[PDB]
From a paper:
The retroviral structural protein Gag forms the immature protein shell of nascent virus particles. During immature virus particle formation, these domains function in membrane binding, viral lattice self-assembly and viral genomic RNA (vgRNA) packaging, respectively. Our results show that HTLV-1 uses a distinct CA-NTD arrangement to form the immature Gag lattice and that, in contrast to other retroviral structures, the CA-NTD is the key determinant of immature HTLV-1 assembly.
To gain insight into the immature architecture of HTLV-1, we used cryo-ET to visualize mammalian cell-derived Gag-based VLPs. However, to account for the observed heterogeneity of HTLV-1 Gag VLP shapes, we applied local C2 symmetry during subtomogram averaging. The resulting maps had a CA-CTD layer that was resolved to a lower resolution than the CA-NTD layer, which we predict is because of heterogeneity caused by flexibility of the CA-CTD. Three-dimensional (3D) classification focused on the CA-CTD yielded a class in which all helices were resolved. Therefore, we used both domains as independent species in a multiparticle refinement using the software M34. This approach yielded 5.9-Å and 6.2-Å resolution maps of the CA-NTD and CA-CTD layers, respectively. Unlike other retroviruses, where the CA-CTD forms interhexameric and intrahexameric contacts, the CA-CTD of HTLV-1 only forms interhexameric contacts. The positioning of the individual HTLV-1 CA-CTD dimers places them out of reach of the adjacent dimers around the hexameric CA ring, not enabling them to contribute to intrahexamerization interfaces forming a lattice. The positions of individual dimers are constrained only by the flexible linker between CA-NTD and CA-CTD.
Residue numbers in the entry: 1 to 79
The structure:
Amino acid sequence: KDPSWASILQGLEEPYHAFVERLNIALDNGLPEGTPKDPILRSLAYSNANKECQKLLQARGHTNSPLGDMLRACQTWTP
């Protein structure tokens, strides 16, 4: 059963921060005790982002950057 949080995908018109927030909440609830959240969150923030935000993140070299940088990068994107 793939972790419920691994299936969280950014919607087509969902702002990136809203998506990251849902992801963050899911990880808080679903990660076993002692599992590092931050590296998982960063990885998923990129890999589960919609195509537009993924492009922005790639273009800026933020495919594994701190979450703050990823948030700033996708802010320019408004559905």
